[PDB]
Amino acid sequence: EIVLTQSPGTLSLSPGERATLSCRASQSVSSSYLAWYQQKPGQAPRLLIYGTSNRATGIPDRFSGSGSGTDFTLTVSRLEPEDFAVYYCQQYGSSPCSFGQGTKLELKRTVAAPSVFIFPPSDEQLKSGTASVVCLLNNFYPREAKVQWKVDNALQSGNSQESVTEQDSKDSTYSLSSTLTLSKADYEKHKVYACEVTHQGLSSPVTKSFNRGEC
Amino acid sequence: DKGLQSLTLDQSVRKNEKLKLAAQGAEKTYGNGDSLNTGKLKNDKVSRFDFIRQIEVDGQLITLESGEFQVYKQSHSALTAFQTEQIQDSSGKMVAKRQFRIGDIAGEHTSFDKLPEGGRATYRGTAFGSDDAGGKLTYTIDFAAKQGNGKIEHLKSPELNVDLAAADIKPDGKRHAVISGSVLYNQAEKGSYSLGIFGGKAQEVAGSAEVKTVNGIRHIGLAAKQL
Amino acid sequence: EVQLVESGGGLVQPGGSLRLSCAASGFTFSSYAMSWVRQAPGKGLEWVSAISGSGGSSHYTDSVKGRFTISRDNSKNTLWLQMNSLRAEDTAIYYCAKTSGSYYYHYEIDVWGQGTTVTVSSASTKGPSVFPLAPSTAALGCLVKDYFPEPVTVSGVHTFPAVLQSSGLYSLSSVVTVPSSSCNVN
Ligand SMILES: [Cl-]
Ligand SMILES: [Cl-]
């Protein structure tokens, strides 16, 4: 029931930099019984290093491992784009076997501003008795962004859900949806709908709005 | 609950080695000289455990061997055996390799000087080798002559169903009755066998055979009892 | 080649039961301990259970001790996980895993399967009502709302992960930028 604590939780680094991933055990673990796994999104994990320092069949020399006692380290001397993924340390020398919580290696790039868009509800949905209002933030880096909903200039709370894409395979940008969910009644009793987006790529917050029934 | 109640592990785990056995949700650790509780195991059958062997090197526990551990228990004798599945490469690295060997042979050894001075005993029991616990050992001791002979039948590998040639009961350095002799297959020397005699009344024999085969030397655990 | 193919996952309700299967190929099955490892949506890897190469020893995370039963068939190159009394938290992708040796621990997972998804909930298969997200250099999309269990298909383009709505149904949008003067879903 050893606990493995990986630090940092997220690590943002440029290709060609050196990466140091850390795994800290709640008690000593033998070097013979510590491994590292790599997992890319929508893929199963893959064995990377076994026995603290042994590369597995098909793993480049770029990847190296070291450690002993309660402290282990994975090193990617020069990061290829293919290496940006989640890494997991696992101890298998005591029962139950345990995995740390993972370290996500993010591909750092130059700031890109969100192209903000807003979508009113369709009329079919104003029939099921609910209205969904969508605010899209498209192709933006870094992932850090705030989206505020306002209905007739009243700041909304608890009625919106966000979903963010994985870092793109080409641009290394993120895309985010914010979905306001309100009753068809509340939708038909209010005129201005607005999503305000704050992003490092923007000198001031961007607002997109529509007026219900107009346009 | 039944005897043989306890086997000293000596051959099966060497000094400073660590032997772990697993069966179902149980796991037990043993060092040289420690006792295996055979009391709860089924008499006249092969009991099965998974095992791993470990040692400390340069301050870290490493693996030396993993696989299956077998125990054949009689009332006054038992023997252990190992089916390896992985073994140290030569380099701090395991490699797949399947080999079979006899571990400890133990029990209430019969004294040579207290053997039956006359009569004929017929022992019936089991011969077991790699992936095959189904063999049948018959052995006969003529205490008048202090000779024994026998044979192995019904192992899946036909080159293992050998004859255990007539051989003498001698005392070893502990004054225990043992038999060392030759193995024959189709009238040809094809290795050797060893048996100790066990029980105050010579009720049992237990030992092993080493049989020459085209695939190399093959080991067979042997145990039998009188009615 | 060394391949591990999971099957048997799907949707059940709380208290229900699923029998995971994993078809092994490309190695000497009986020589290797095998394990199940799971991954709850958006979380880390959690070790579930393991069984020795011979099938004679087994162990489980206490979470599933009593509820789950691992087993194998060394004659048919098959690993099983019997999941009885399933619960909400058992929802996850379950990976079959081959370790590098016979003992149920002390060996690393050297091969992973593709994963079989398990969902435990009361929600019933429903279907996707696909709304337009029409344009006002532009942007246009579809709102795939209130749909069965995961997943849904949608064919520059950004298909968003699904969000579990306070209802229990999933919802996502697929958006596509396209020139200003210019939804293959399910
Ligand atoms: Cl409010
Ligand atoms: Cl045990």
Author numbering:
A (entry chain B): 2 to 216
B (entry chain C): 28 to 117, 120 to 256
C (entry chain A): 1 to 136, 144 to 162, 171 to 197, 205 to 208
Text lifted from the article:
To determine the structural bases for the complex effects of the two human Fabs on FH binding to FHbp, we crystallized and determined the structures of the two human Fabs in complexes with FHbp by X-ray crystallography. The 1.7- and 2.0-Å resolution X-ray crystal structures of the Fabs in complexes with FHbp illustrate that the two Fabs bind to similar epitopes on the amino-terminal domain of FHbp, adjacent to the FH binding site. Despite the differences between the two Fabs in their effects on FH binding and kinetics, and their difference in cross-reactivity with one of the FHbp variants tested, they bound to similar epitopes on the amino-terminal domain of FHbp. A superposition of the Fab molecules from the two complexes identifies the largest structural differences in CDR-H3 and -L1. CDR-H3 has backbone shifts of as much as 3 Å between the two complexes. From an analysis of the polar contacts between Fabs and FHbp using PISA, 6 of 10 H-bond interactions are the same in both complexes. Notably, the Fabs affected the conformations and mobilities of two prominent surface-exposed loops compared with the structure of FHbp alone. Each of the human Fabs displaces these two loops of FHbp away from the Fab and decreases the B-factors of backbone atoms in these loops, which is seen as a decrease in the radius of the tube representations. Collectively, the structures reveal that the Fabs enhance binding of FH to FHbp by altering the conformations and mobilities of two loops adjacent to the FH binding site of FHbp. Superposition models of ternary complexes of each Fab with FHbp and FH show that there is likely minimal contact between the Fabs and FH.
The bacterial pathogen Neisseria meningitidis, or meningococcus, binds several complement regulators, including human Factor H (FH). One of these proteins, which had been independently discovered as GNA1870 and LP2086, was found to bind FH and renamed Factor H binding protein (FHbp). FHbp was developed as a key antigen in two licensed meningococcal serogroup B vaccines. In the present study, we show that two vaccine-elicited antibody fragments (Fabs) isolated from different human subjects increase binding of complement FH to meningococcal FHbp by ELISA.
